[PDB]
Amino acid sequence: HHHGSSLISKTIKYDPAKDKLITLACGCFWGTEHMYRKYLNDRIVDCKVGYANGEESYKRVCGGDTDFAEVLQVSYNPKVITLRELTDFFFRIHDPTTSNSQGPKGTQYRSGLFAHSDADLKELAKIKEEWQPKWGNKIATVIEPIKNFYDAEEYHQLYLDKNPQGYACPTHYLREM
Amino acid sequence: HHHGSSLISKTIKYDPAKDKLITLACGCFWGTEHMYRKYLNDRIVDCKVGYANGEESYKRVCGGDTDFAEVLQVSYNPKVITLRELTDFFFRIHDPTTSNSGTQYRSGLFAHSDADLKELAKIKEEWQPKWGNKIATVIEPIKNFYDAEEYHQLYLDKNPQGYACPTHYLREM
Secondary structure, eight states: OOSSGGGSOSSSOOOTTTOEEEEEEESSHHHHHHHHHHHHGGGSSEEEEEEEEEOOOOOOBTTBOTTOEEEEEEEEOTTTSOHHHHHHHHTTSSOOBGGGSOOOOOGGGOEEEEESSHHHHHHHHHHHHHHHHHHOSOBOOEEEEEEEEEEHHHHHHHTOTTOTTOTTOOSOOOOOO | OOSSGGGSOSSOOOOTTTOEEEEEESSOHHHHHHHHHHHHGGGSSEEEEEEEEEOOOOSOBTTBOTTOEEEEEEEEOTTTSOHHHHHHHHTTSSOOBTTOOOGGGOOEEEESSHHHHHHHHHHHHHHGGGGTTOBOOEEEEEEEEEEHHHHHHHHOTTOTTOTTOOSOOOOOO
8 A cells, every 4th residue: 555564564563653663774683683672672662673775865685685784673662762862872883884884795784774754864864973973984874765674584485486495695594494 | 721711601501510512603693692592592501602713714803813703602401402403403594505605604613522523524414415515614623712792802902993893782982
């Protein structure tokens, strides 16, 4: 029905009457999930790992489109925790600068913020600029409106192809084998 | 005192009278930790993330030697789960072949005994046909282990921001 259901985790706890979403790319998503759960589990509604890409202004990613990034989608109540606090945390749990951006080439691990609203896109761009003096080295984080999100397990099923063992997929998951 | 104390995680629950250790590399260690805890938590004693290398890229690994791998160290009671079962699980949670594909994310098994080294080599050989005989997993005696927190304190002393370290951890800034 093109109301953006393709942008939300199928399994995440989320009520649009009171919650908001933010989708975060900063390395292997089990790492991102560990950090948010370790430090902020009692202040977020839910989070789910998966793959996402953005409206943008080579090598397939685990059988899917070349631009997919490993992400954590976070559902939160803005009266409990702000987007600013969630984003400040993002900019402290990885190296978001060009010293960690992929140039040896696995783009699925890129630093990225996928915004679920026009207003969010603007606030995130502001927060990135405010982190630049502290990071010093050029921040590489891309900020894009979200275009697709799939829960991890769902994505592995969608792009199964003829590859149940996940050859050439660097992501941990229990293969069907 | 040169008895291999360094090869064990400082924080792991481990009793040498009944438990054994295996140190596993198969991607980012938070991924490896998530897999063992999600599926095998009731069958292992404990597990801890860190960086290890073994008795055998130019890029340093979070400031340390180029051969360090991100690993999970697992402590287990062989009467509750066997080394083979842990390794069978290892070979089903990642692509251990040359199609996948820094080097700290390589597939590897770091053995804590000579007997384990021989058993692991035999398991790898038995697994070859299922992975099209292209298993790239390195099997080596473990040479060093550092808790992730301890390694960062050691090789990132002058780099609190962890520039060029791909590992997730909370930078103090």
